[PDB]
Amino acid sequence: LIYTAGGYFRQSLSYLEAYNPSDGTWLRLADLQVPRSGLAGCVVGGLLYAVGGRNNSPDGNTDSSALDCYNPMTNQWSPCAPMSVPRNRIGVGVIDGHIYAVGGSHGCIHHNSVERYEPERDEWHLVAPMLTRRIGVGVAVLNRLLYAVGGFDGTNRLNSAECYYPERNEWRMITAMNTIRSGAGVCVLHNCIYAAGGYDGQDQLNSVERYDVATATWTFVAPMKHRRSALGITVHQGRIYVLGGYDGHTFLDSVECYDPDTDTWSEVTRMTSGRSGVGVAVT
């Protein structure tokens, strides 16, 4: 199922809801213990993780350094060790069963730092920083390499992307995207890195482009129906699913689905309530 955790509508949310693309059902599961938006989600060893974010509420606006783990067999959240700094609008990718936390903000500070979590030791350790400060950064893993794509450096929104080599622990810039995108959905489908939607400083985007490693080229594919930034994104059964977001006026419940073979986006479901800034993963 596609799990979405957290998000924002009027305040940061605790929701954990799981969608079944088979029967179209929405399952409601255990609440996050602390609300959070601008987090990221991943899955390691069959356990679902919620990383960073912040709790934006009527009584505070606290950036989160928290790492929290949901077991689909127990329906229970458990705390893990926290990151070295709070990271709102974080990006995460999974390499070799390790969780990489990328960028994000703490107050005015826009991080270029990166750190790596070892689930079997429940510890974080800092790795090499990105070349660019990036919040609202999209992160994807391809051929055991970590890509940081787009985002916002505190002043400029970014079309640049860079690549992390775990064996050499160093970052290398790659070809920039055709479009500047902060708060896009960034995943890997088959063997391209996809960047969908985002915000370019003036408008939310519906365009979608994909990166081909061998040619180092970004190409546009079919656009989504609805422009959106701060969306969740995941891959389910060779399909791309994007969930919610913000279009400059409204918080979307729309869930769109990209069929790569037809190069077509379809409306597949609505979330139970519109929201932005969710964390999403599959298990």
Binding site: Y8, S37, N56, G136, F152, S182, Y199, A230, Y246, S276
Partner: peptide
């Protein structure tokens, strides 16, 4: 509002 996420700033 944050123009990107919709959150109250």
């Amino acid at each position: 509002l944050d123009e990107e996420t919709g959150e109250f700033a």
